Write a protein that binds this ligand. Structure first.
Ligand SMILES: O=C(O)[C@H]1O[C@@H](N2CCC(=C3c4ccc(Cl)cc4CCc4cc(O)cnc43)CC2)[C@H](O)[C@@H](O)[C@@H]1O
Ligand SMILES: O=C(O)[C@H]1O[C@@H](N2CCC(=C3c4ccc(Cl)cc4CCc4cc(O)cnc43)CC2)[C@H](O)[C@@H](O)[C@@H]1O
Lengths: 581, 581
């Protein structure tokens, strides 16, 4: 259970962000117990941010192993009466928190929050907070790291590591609000849709009165309820809608603690080959994104988030997929405010491939299902209340058509559907090569999400031949009667390369590629969404197939529009959110 | 008096940063008293950051007038016992702070901090904090804005406005440390240089004991002193040096309040035509920078700051000038940690130009000297203790060779030299066209800082002819016997444009331009520094002479190296910090 720490009349919030003491481990780092004394010959490193690109030389960018963040923490004794918590929004990949020298916390998982209590191990004056981060990836990590001293990522994006998201401190009374949940049953039958909202507060500590208050957009009060559980009757409810968002406020007063939560009233339901939002046939318009900026790397970047959402509404999009890892809490909340449809995805990327071993080989294969279940647990525990999240993605391009694959995902799908209070659709992004008959996603998933590159990796530069292929496979996928959407498709384009008679990597070819694909898409009424790959150019590991990173983005890494970006904006302008099919 | 709010055993610090409620004024904004009720139909805007580039359309970028930031503030009553302060690191240009509807603070000045007290006007639960920002510039603002409904900046950089730097909240006991000052008298006579440091603490409130403690780099204690004033004897003092920084810690315990301060022991003194740091002949290597990134605009950007300082040490630079406005506190402190020489400059840019009026015309001219004195007051009050600041710049390219000019600056120079506890050199950046005989900087300034463009605006593309000119004027400047340095010189280069036989705007020409200039520079021993313009490409107002902004940077706006960047790195590698002349 992880609530987003905010500022409230009952709780504080001190951002530990700034320039910390930084030092690359040299192997002897742990034996010599650097976490006690200061960082001798320390360096400077801003937090939050990925450290790989913040210094020159490959030895900082391509570091293998541990790095030590160090900082000076201090609290006034008049606050020790409250509950002190250290919240780490994200640490990529493996974090180990020390306080004066005592290991107080550990976490496996570089893209989800985790907190620890500081009341017992604090001191009186200056305390030495030491956060050690590991970047190693292997068959036991999500994302998955291969092998053939450097990390070999089994994924197509750079291994940005470090304190990726903010590290803050917040307080709370002894008996506090530890978690909250809210679902909505919307009565679309009446001429005006009314709504009934069910809540459930979980307290913790030496309990015992609980109060909840409902407010609207402006802040006007609307109703009140008592107890750890209750409901709200909203006649004339203002439904959260794609691109037309509306968020109510919820103020829960429990004992000596208060916490507010913005909630969006909307319904999500799959019906045959139709993805229904608020009981209407929705069509996905957008692209798979990355949390990738320069030189922040994977580090949080609120200004760029607002710019991207501006570029999106500029382009007439409505959705994106948190490609290959969960995004920041801030970006999720922003999509609630701005009304952006989001496909929340886990870190489960790279679960694929004297003898060739098999993905799900019990002895020499991925050892990730345990942690994979944790992520599904922690991901939903965090974003369960986000009205923008309309579906979960268990994994990106796994070996979903291989032996043991179905056995691997079935418990994960179940855990997901048993944990989502709203019981939202579940899916997995199908790598190219799978078919309706071979993909275990055909049975497990509510929506089929394809990653196809007809016209690039498969068929390019012959777009004519590539078209018949795309049509042949897409037509086959209709046999399932489920909703089909493309979550990835694009061609690497180096901004600035032009040609009248186009060739691969030019801006002209990139547009043609999306014209041919979109043409086929519109031929089938069970295609309920198109999301291009990628929103913008992003960094990867070096390779002959990567022209200074991934260049399949519609925009450059600095958000500048390629010619394709205008193409889509024109297309998506004449395509509505509902009723397209 | 403005101390940098940090985290201490006696004081808190809650970063109000995040996505605030935003709304462009429409004229009726103030009459309709938006600062009381919420922002109806509000928008999203991250803080801190310039808002001009965070939304699409010229109407947000080219807005004229007011914008309303709104936010929800809340404090627990158990903290009301302390002193509550709202610190605004920067608001560009004019800020007006409301709390529940009551105007509680105002400030003129978009690039320096200002705080206000919240104890008296707080409420119990949720408070509506409303920060209104104005972007208008005219003859009464610094920077100066001209005329011929839009702002016409009298300067060559875009008018990025909004909550440019962080807005935080910090507490402190009734009797607190309000200000601190530290100077150093270094005895360079002994074989080992010892040092004596003089401090001076200023308290405020219902007083009455004061304690100060000195620590070194690691954190080991070194000495102790009592009283609001005292000294420290440092035998074997570790002198802060350019590119070899060393900062001591200073822990002042006054009553129920503590505050720590990193200090760097170094001496600055001009001797004839020699700029002496720690009694050695220093040579400036660097460039004039901007606080300009995309899409942040002028907004703070700690990751880029660390990257720029990496690029600098990569390039073998040692100094930069806070071109045309004071930079963030974080960047100043970082230069102390990283050992970067800084020329702190004020916002006094644009003080230049049926009849042609004169700059300092008493009735129809710049009405800025009053505010100009404030900035000189507040700038030194903030950065007085930064061992990286080795000189002050009263103004950039003013009309320093016109009637009334000398009368305008003389009181400003005096106020500067009377306020700097360290009595550091003072100068002003001389626009092209001035000569040793005409520039009032010849008498007022300790160091001559020239902004010359021989080979671009003046002479280009004939670099041969441009050379004789540069030599003729530079030789003349030697008549003063003072130290001369170029704070600006460069040629607009569009990254990617190449030619064997170079032309203007190509990368080849840019290198040639700096070769010719640097050749002449090295012919004169009274030239003690070279700083190119600019560090990287930055945004300006649109114009036929601006190719999508200013492109004179050595690096692109995203910090990528142009061919010139490697040229300098090779040159600056064979040029030392001391003894070059
Ligand atoms: O096209 C992208 O590369 C982007 O789209 C997705 N991406 C899709 C392409 C991927 C493949 C792959 C898998 C099966 C077959 Cl038959 C062909 C190919 C192409 C070449 C190839 C070569 C390899 O060595 C490894 N993996 C592949 C999987 C990855 C990913 O989801 C995304 O991370 C990536 O950036
Ligand atoms: O070259 C830059 O433009 C950069 O260097 C500095 N910059 C120097 C060039 C500036 C001038 C100027 C002034 C006197 C004379 Cl004789 C010629 C010229 C050139 C053209 C010209 C045209 C105008 O309409 C107004 N101002 C000028 C002053 C400004 C500034 O300090 C910096 O802000 C700027 O970005």
């Amino acid at each position: 259970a992880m609530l987003y720490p905010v500022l409230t009349q009952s709780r504080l919030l001190s951002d530990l962000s700034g320039v910390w003491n930084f030092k690359l481990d040299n192997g002897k780092g742990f034996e010599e117990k650097w976490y006690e004394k200061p960082l001798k010959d320390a360096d400077t490193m801003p937090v939050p941010a990925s450290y790989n690109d913040l210094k020159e030389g490959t030895d900082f960018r391509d570091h293998y192993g541990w790095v030590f963040y160090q900082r000076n923490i201090s609290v006034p004794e008049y606050v020790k009466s409250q509950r002190i918590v250290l919240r780490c929004a994200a640490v990529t990949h493996y974090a180990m928190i020390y306080l004066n020298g005592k290991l107080i916390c550990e976490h496996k998982g570089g893209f989800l929050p985790f907190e620890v209590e500081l009341n017992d191990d604090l001191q009186d004056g200056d305390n030495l907070l030491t956060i050690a981060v590991n970047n190693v990836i292997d068959y036991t990590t999500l994302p998955v790291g291969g092998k053939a001293p450097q990390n070999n990522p089994n994924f197509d994006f750079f291994n940005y590591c470090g304190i990726t998201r903010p590290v803050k401190i917040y307080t709370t009374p002894e008996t506090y609000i530890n978690d909250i949940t809210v679902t909505a049953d919307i009565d679309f039958t009446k001429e005006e849709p009314s709504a009934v909202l069910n809540y459930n507060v979980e307290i913790k500590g030496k309990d015992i009165t609980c109060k909840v208050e409902l407010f609207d957009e402006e802040g006007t009060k609307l109703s009140e309820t008592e107890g750890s559980e209750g409901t709200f009757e909203i006649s004339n409810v203002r439904l959260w809608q794609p691109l037309n968002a509306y968020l109510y406020k919820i103020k829960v007063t429990a004992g000596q603690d208060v916490y507010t939560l913005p909630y969006g009233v909307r319904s999500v339901r799959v019906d045959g080959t139709k993805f229904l939002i608020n009981e209407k046939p929705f069509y996905f318009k957008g692209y798979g994104k990355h949390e990738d900026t320069f030189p922040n790397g994977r580090g949080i970047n609120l200004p760029m988030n607002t710019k991207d959402i501006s570029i999106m509404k500029w382009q007439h999009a409505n959705s994106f997929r948190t490609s290959h890892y969960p995004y920041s809490e801030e970006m999720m909340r922003l999509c609630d405010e701005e009304g952006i449809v989001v496909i929340d995805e886990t870190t489960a990327v790279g679960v694929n491939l004297g003898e060739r071993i098999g993905t799900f080989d019990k002895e020499h294969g991925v050892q990730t299902q345990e942690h994979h279940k944790d992520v599904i647990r922690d991901l939903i525990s965090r974003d369960k209340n986000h009205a923008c999240v309309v579906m979960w993605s268990i994994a990106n391009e796994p070996d979903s058509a291989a032996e043991g694959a179905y056995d691997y995902f079935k418990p994960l799908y179940d855990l997901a559907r048993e944990l989502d209070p709203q019981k939202r659709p579940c899916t997995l992004v199908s790598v190219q090569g799978t078919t309706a008959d071979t993909d275990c996603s055909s049975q497990l998933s509510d929506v089929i999400c394809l990653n196809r590159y007809y016209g690039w990796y498969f068929g390019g530069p012959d777009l004519e031949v590539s078209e018949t292929g795309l049509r042949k496979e897409l037509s086959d996928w209709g046999k399932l009667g489920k909703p089909v959407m493309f979550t990835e498709y694009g061609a690497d384009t180096v901004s600035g390369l032009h040609d009248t008679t186009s060739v691969m990597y030019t801006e002209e070819y990139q547009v043609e590629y999306y014209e041919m694909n979109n043409k086929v898409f519109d031929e089938f009424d069970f295609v309920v969404g198109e999301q291009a790959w990628n929103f913008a150019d992003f960094a990867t590991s070096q390779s002959l197939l990567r022209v200074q990173g991934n260049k399949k983005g519609l925009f450059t890494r600095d958000r500048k529009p390629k010619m394709v970006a205008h193409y889509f904006r024109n297309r998506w302008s004449a395509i509505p959110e509902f009723g397209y099919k």
